[PDB]
Write a protein that binds this DNA or RNA. Sequence first.
RNA 1: ACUGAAACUGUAGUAGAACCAAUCGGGGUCGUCAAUA
Length: 114
Amino acid sequence: EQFEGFVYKTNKNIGNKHDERVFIIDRESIEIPLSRDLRRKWRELITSYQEIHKKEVDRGDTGPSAVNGAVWSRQIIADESERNLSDGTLCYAHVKKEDGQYKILNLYPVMITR
RNA sequence: ACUGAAACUGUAGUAGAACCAAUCGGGGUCGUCAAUA
């Protein structure tokens, strides 16, 4: 196939990680209204990521002490710009279909998330 | 078309009586952390 897309590169944030993922825009697409409830939940989840590791990062660890061969996942070392869901940011969205509606429950920065 | 003189703003009076630097708190203890293949 041929596609066009965005590379949703995060870092090598776990030891078994081989690949980044890239979002294929050339093909089928759907959109949902972005609620202010999602905006706060994003800010709040990312705050946790950034806040919880602040001390490990500032003493200069390059990755979690509990997983060798890995480096800070992109969102946890990112600037506070990441903490605001500004236009064109890339996310994973946790979704279900209900009543034929693509309900979005949360926005999450990584496939398996905090 | 003769300046009045002489005369302590002084004497007596406690910035004091009452008032708690005090009330609460085991030097204690378990699961998290990272995301993909």
